[PDB]
Every structure is written in C-alpha cells, then in structure tokens.
Amino acid sequence: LAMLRGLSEDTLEQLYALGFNQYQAGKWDDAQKIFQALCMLDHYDARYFLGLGACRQSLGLYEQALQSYSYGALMDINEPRFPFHAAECHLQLGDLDGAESGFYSARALAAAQPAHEALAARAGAMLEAVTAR
Amino acid sequence: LAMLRGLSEDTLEQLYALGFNQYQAGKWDDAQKIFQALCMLDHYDARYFLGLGACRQSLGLYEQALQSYSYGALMDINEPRFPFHAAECHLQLGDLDGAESGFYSARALAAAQPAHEALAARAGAMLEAVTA
Numbered sequence: 001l002a003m004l005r006g007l008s009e010d011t012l013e014q015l016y017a018l019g020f021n022q023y024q025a026g027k028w029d030d031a032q033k034i035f036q037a038l039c040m041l042d043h044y045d046a047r048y049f050l051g052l053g054a055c056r057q058s059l060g061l062y063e064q065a066l067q068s069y070s071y072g073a074l075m076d077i078n079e080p081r082f083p084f085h086a087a088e089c090h091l092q093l094g095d096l097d098g099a100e101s102g103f104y105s106a107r108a109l110a111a112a113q114p115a116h117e118a119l120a121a122r123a124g125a126m127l128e129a130v131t132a133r
Numbered sequence: 134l135a136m137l138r139g140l141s142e143d144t145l146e147q148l149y150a151l152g153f154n155q156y157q158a159g160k161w162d163d164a165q166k167i168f169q170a171l172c173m174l175d176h177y178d179a180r181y182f183l184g185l186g187a188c189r190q191s192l193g194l195y196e197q198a199l200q201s202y203s204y205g206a207l208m209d210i211n212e213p214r215f216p217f218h219a220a221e222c223h224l225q226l227g228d229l230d231g232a233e234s235g236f237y238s239a240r241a242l243a244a245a246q247p248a249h250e251a252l253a254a255r256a257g258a259m260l261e262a263v264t265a
Contacts, residue, residue, distance in 0.1 A: 001176055074200050
C-alpha cells in the first residue's frame, strides 16, 4: 500500500484490467489481492468492490464477498450487480430472506437500465425460485 | 488532486491533531475537510475514517457517515468502533436490522479488547434497547 500510492489514472485503470483478466482466467486469489490493493488506493470505484466481491464469491468466501458488495452498493446506489451477487451470496449462506430482497432490488435497479436488461431477467428468475424455495 | 502529497509522518500527525481539535471544538465542516484530505493523502489510518465518520454524524449526514465506517470495517476487521458507530447511523436512518448487527459485532470485538471496555458496555446496553 505504502510505496504504491500516487499512481496515475492510466496506471490504476491498467491495474484493474490486469485484475479483471486474472479474474476471467480464474486466478481468484491473485485477483483478490489486486482488487484489495486497488480498494486501498481508491475507496470510490465500485468496480473494485465488484471485483473484490466476485473474487471472494468464486473462492467460497461468502460473508466477506457480502461485505465488499454492501460497501459498493453504498457507493453506487444504481449498480444492480451489488444487490444481485449479494443475493447469490445470501443463497449459499442459506438465507432465503436476504436473497429475495437482493434479487428484488437488483431486478428493480436493472430494469431502468438498457445495459442491464439481460440481468434483470436473471434476477427475476432467481427471485421466483427463492419464493419457493 | 491535493498535490500537497509527500508530507512527512510528523506533518500528517499534526494535521491529524488539527482536524481533531476542530472536531472537538464543533468546527465540523472544517474538521470534515481535514479528515477527507488526510484519507486521501496518507496511507490507511483508522483515525481518519473514524473522524470523518464522526464529523458527518454530528452534521446529521448519516448515510455519508455509514460509508466512512463501512469502509473502515471493510479494511480493518478488528476495530470495534467501525461497527459500533455504524449501528448508531443505522438507528437514525430507520434501519433497526443494520443497527442490531452492528452493535452485536461491536460488542464481540469490543469485549475481547481490554482497552475498549466502555465500548463493550455501551454496545451492550445499545443492543438491549434495540431488540424491542
């Protein structure tokens, strides 16, 4: 954290892409580490909590995932993917109430947003599987 | 942004004490601005987020305070004042659930930590109150 402070936007951007690419290739603990650092270097780029969360998810780290997602949501109240993946976390914690609120928030948030139409559906369908049960 | 980068550890510490006295003295908007500058200049220090959060409370900006304390707890799991103070904001915001977790988690970490004894009791009593 110490000597890596002060980097420019162009570098921060490329660093994220690196984390994102390792995330795709399934190198999740490496990706975690990268996002953790990025979340150290800028506490207002939802993207980095999206990434941190997702790495933890794919790691089986549901509670921890849940924490990133929740802070991200506080930082970007429009991003449907926070309440959506939180809910998949809730589901694996075996918390049906939380998963239902989450898919409901996400479906809602996602419907106003032309970019997220193909996830609004996904949330609506998860929502009615959790209804029962 | 705030090109006032590269300050020595001695200087950041007095700038921190300076925010602290502004807070103490009810100069909150001002103290707020100092803690934000500090969060943004120096390596993580919990006291920065703890002051920012505390300034926002006293200004009645509970959402904003929650962000602060929630970043604190996300990076600093064993600090109990992050969940404790977050719970307080949950109260004012109309979220009894949020408040109940916070206080309980605050109590737990707080109970183990001989230093933070009063936080333990304070978090003790708060939980009771909230349950009904």
